[PDB]
Design a protein around this ligand. Structure first.
Ligand SMILES: O=C(NC[C@H]1O[C@@H](n2ccc(=O)[nH]c2=O)[C@H](O)[C@@H]1O)c1cccc(CO[C@H]2O[C@H](CO)[C@H](O)[C@H](O)[C@H]2O)n1
Ligand SMILES: O=C(NC[C@H]1O[C@@H](n2ccc(=O)[nH]c2=O)[C@H](O)[C@@H]1O)c1cccc(CO[C@H]2O[C@H](CO)[C@H](O)[C@H](O)[C@H]2O)n1
Ligand SMILES: CCCCCCCCO[C@@H]1O[C@H](CO)[C@H](O)[C@H](O)[C@H]1O[C@@H]1O[C@@H](C)[C@@H](O)[C@@H](O)[C@@H]1O
Ligand SMILES: CCCCCCCCO[C@@H]1O[C@H](CO)[C@H](O)[C@H](O)[C@H]1O[C@@H]1O[C@@H](C)[C@@H](O)[C@@H](O)[C@@H]1O
Ligand SMILES: [Mn+2]
Ligand SMILES: [Mn+2]
Lengths: 289, 289
């Protein structure tokens, strides 16, 4: 549950926070609207685990496996079992056009998986974009009654390290691994004023990755429905955003600031980008071609 | 209002956040439970003002002026008018045993003041401690219906610089100016196990000042009633905490982590402590003896 009476934390022994020592000297750890930017070294996971377990938090994880992308499910789910919200209640939601192609992955206690059959679109762009509509629709069908938070990710990925309750917040986006060091003018936002996703050269905080976002069910419903409705307007006007659902996500998060931002630890491609000094952990990474 | 449907921010032009540049190199700007620690340079006030104005936020400010402390009200209120939540709806609540001694201070538009008559206790310790009971009681009498957030401060103080919506959050405490650089063993927590305020030598995050705390009305009600009930248990057991209400506040905030922590910019004494390099602004300061 969220926003419900909270019991006291028990006695815990851990290192005292150091007021006169920055937790990172190489990166920004808070946005200008006071949202934490989540990097290794910013959080004590023992404190956070206590806070979230005392609230009996349930996390939903959505993934789309349409057409040939069913092949990615086995590694995705196996690695999620090792690294994603371990110790907490988890509900996996696999959206697919092939229910029989979902692998039988052995799950830890307190973790469950539901298969949600959906239609397949012909174009990969529409498969990607229509995730917004489908996530929004299911926020009523079951998410509101079943989970506290939703995490929405790409399937062609694997967990390599801890992804836990440090990410949970009303609304989060993730720094895109290709652009975290780029100036806003270089961001690949939609730049045509005719599109609902339009962002001018002098606006923008970050370039967020379409492959990893989430928050409370209420806030994810708002985000996904807003993006879907914006994509429908674009379609009526005969325009499709340069980076599809990701362009609209970026527009939404510019106008509705996330309450946490995840570092590129949480969305990476090692083949393409290596392992820079700024990343102490690689948590969730692209599966090589 | 809090937690209500939020409209989009308008287009704004401001400097892009720098992912690879820490906003401070000399201080901790986020707690290990991912609560922002509010220092100058961590926030863009233009973004925050937009977010809070769009929600039509009302802030209550409580102050106790009992017996001779009525003399501090004129400067306190005059300086609050220059520096506290300017542009937002404010409701001052002056608790006093002398309604006729409250100075007629000229208020800006959208700002109001209510005088709340209470009893005076003989001992200064009880005057200080019984603030918890009185704040808790009034959370029902009017605060729930009148304000979104409550800020609870000492009266023998003056505003010298901006104190605004950057502090607002469900629950906040403030780093005590005498101890922000101290190790936990040196903190003047209550150390007798017989007291409800007891904290062992190996526990504690920060030493919070009793002179400046707040949050949402719901969370302030919880804090103040918990501290009052704990003080009543102590009284029944013939013990009084070393630093009175401040000892209990520290116990509560250890077990219920605040969602923001304010730097000593927000609670200072220049006569006693000077003006260190770490403080870019002195916002709220003791009135010299
Ligand atoms: O991730 C993609 N789409 C977003 C998500 O949308 C879902 N999706 C998309 C299309 C689809 O047919 N089925 C499906 O389930 C699935 O969950 C995907 O993760 C996507 C779409 C087109 C191409 C690629 C991959 O393109 C490049 O990146 C890879 C990363 O290792 C490889 O380098 C690959 O060779 C390269 O083409 N991903
Ligand atoms: O602030 C105090 N109490 C907490 C609040 O409690 C309220 N209070 C307390 C007692 C009281 O009789 N009336 C009253 O309204 C008032 O709002 C106070 O701000 C307090 C209590 C005792 C002594 C002092 C001041 O002690 C020392 O600090 C001052 C800071 O400049 C001067 O240095 C002063 O000389 C020194 O004794 N403050
Ligand atoms: C100036 C430095 C230029 C170098 C930057 C290289 C990263 C580019 O990244 C692509 O960025 C696009 C937006 O502009 C889309 O988000 C696309 O999905 C993404 O490729 C995806 O994510 C990538 C990380 C890879 O895994 C790629 O294979 C994926 O298809
Ligand atoms: C090791 C360095 C030791 C040097 C530290 C000096 C600051 C001590 O501070 C006192 O701390 C107490 C708790 O231990 C109470 O909070 C007390 O109200 C406070 O004095 C108040 O606040 C102060 C800032 C002054 O304004 C003082 O006049 C007030 O009465
Ligand atoms: Mn992909
Ligand atoms: Mn005082």
């Amino acid at each position: 549950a969220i926003g419900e009476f909270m019991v006291s934390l028990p006695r815990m022994v851990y290192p005292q926070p150091k007021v006169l020592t920055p937790c990172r000297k190489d990166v920004l750890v808070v946005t200008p609207w006071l949202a934490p930017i989540v990097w290794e070294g910013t959080f004590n996971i023992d404190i956070l685990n206590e806070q979230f377990r005392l609230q009996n938090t349930t996390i939903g994880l959505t993934v789309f496996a349409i057409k040939k992308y069913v092949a990615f499910l086995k590694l995705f789910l196996e690695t999620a079992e090792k690294h994603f919200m371990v110790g907490h209640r988890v509900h996996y939601y696999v959206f697919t056009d092939q229910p029989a192609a979902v692998p039988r992955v052995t799950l830890g206690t307190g973790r469950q998986l539901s298969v949600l059959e959906v239609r397949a679109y012909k174009r990969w762009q529409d498969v990607s974009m229509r995730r917004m509509e489908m996530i929004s629709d299911f926020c009523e069908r079951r998410f509101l009654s079943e989970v506290d938070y939703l995490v929405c990710v790409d399937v062609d990925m694997e967990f390599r390290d801890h992804v836990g309750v440090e990410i949970l917040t009303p609304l989060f986006g993730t720094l895109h691994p290709g652009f975290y060091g780029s100036s806003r003018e270089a961001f690949t936002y939609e730049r045509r004023p005719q599109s609902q996703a339009y962002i001018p050269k002098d606006e923008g905080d970050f370039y967020y990755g379409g492959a990893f976002f989430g928050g409370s069910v209420q806030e994810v419903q708002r985000l996904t429905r807003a993006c879907h409705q914006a994509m429908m307007v674009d379609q009526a006007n005969g325009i499709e955003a340069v980076w599809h659902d990701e362009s609209h996500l970026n527009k939404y998060l510019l106008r509705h600031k996330p309450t946490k931002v995840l570092s590129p630890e949480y969305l990476w491609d090692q083949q393409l980008l290596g392992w820079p000094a700024v990343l102490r952990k690689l948590r969730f990474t692209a599966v090589p071609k």
